[PDB]
């Protein structure tokens with residue numbers, strides 16, 4: 259298992275990164291510092307997570323300390339839905355750069371295919387509670403992303419939560435200048451994504467798996483929901499390999515040629531989660547884990563199910 263995967267922009271991306279959604283601002287600086295100390299070279303960020311300033315403090319301190327060089331880091335962020343407008347994309351990217359203390363991003367993603375009305379609110383609602391859309395389409399937003407590459411602000415651009423028809427729309431864009439490098443999607447044994455993964459990989463687009471542990475800290479969790487970390491079938495595979503259940507859940511996408519971004523703010527778990535380059539799941543193990551699919555989503559974007567670009571009506 260090599261540590262990096264080659265992207266279609268010619269750059270290499272570390273296959274294991276640190277997630278930062280829900281990482282409290284008072285804990286995430288330490289989390290990222292510890293992560294870099296124990297070997298992480300890829301951090302997954304987003305403006306909407308409201309903690310990029312604090313992530314940036316950690317990155318900058320480790321650069322200043324010469325623990326790592328900037329070229330050895332792979333920093334990812336995402337354009338939020340209220341910034342899909344041509345005239346807002348650069349400023350959104352620049353705000354993220356300023357917060358992260360960087361002069362470029364390694365990868366910048368369209369966070370969701372759905373554009374929302376610009377303004378202070380991340381989810382602008384009408385008087386009845388539906389998200390208020392933007393009229394700006396996926397293709398014009400993509401053109402704005404391409405401009406960021408040409409201005410030196412980002413080294414690669416990609417997409418997140420795009421279904422295969424939406425990926426296809428970009429690939430078929432008239433005058434397409436840069437193909438998406440990455441599609442970041444939810445993926446774990448309860449949402450195995452075989453169809454979408456195959457499609458993206460066949461087009462040379464690298465897939466990043468989010469919520470690989472099933473996001474037990476997701477704010478809308480309910481007691482009756484399935485739980486990957488507590489699934490005795492997965493625990494059994496972990497026990498056989500003398501690893502933790504989380505380590506199995508992280509190794510699983512790695513062996514499918516995916517990038518994976520487990521989140522933790524717990525120093526011991528941050529270190530644990532990185533120790534996944536010392537064992538191999540068998541083909542049988544992999545197929546067994548795949549068999550647990552139930553099309554269950556942590557992130558279903560439920561306030562946007564009527565948006566013209568809602569991604570999850572399509573089968574994949």
Ligand SMILES: NC(=O)c1ccc[n+]([C@@H]2O[C@H](COP(=O)([O-])OP(=O)(O)OC[C@H]3O[C@@H](n4cnc5c(N)ncnc54)[C@H](OP(=O)(O)O)[C@@H]3O)[C@@H](O)[C@H]2O)c1
Pocket residue numbers: 276277278279280302303369418419442443467468469470471472473474475487502504505519520521522523524527528530531556557
């Ligand atoms: N593009 C998108 O739309 C999108 C959507 C969702 C997520 N993401 C990205 O993907 C990252 C990962 O997804 P996620 O945050 O939803 O959830 P996740 O990585 O599947 O799970 C995070 C949870 O697992 C716990 N955990 C971590 N390591 C553990 C271990 N070794 N043993 C037991 N529990 C462990 C964490 O606890 P502690 O932190 O307390 O240790 C936290 O509660 C996000 O942080 C974000 O960067 C992107």
Ligand SMILES: C#CCNC(=O)c1ccc(F)cc1OCC(=O)O
Pocket residue numbers: 279304306307308556557558559560
């Ligand atoms: C379900 C769903 C869609 N996402 C959200 O509602 C959301 C909102 C804010 C945030 F910080 C993370 C959020 O979810 C994770 C993400 O989108 O990266």
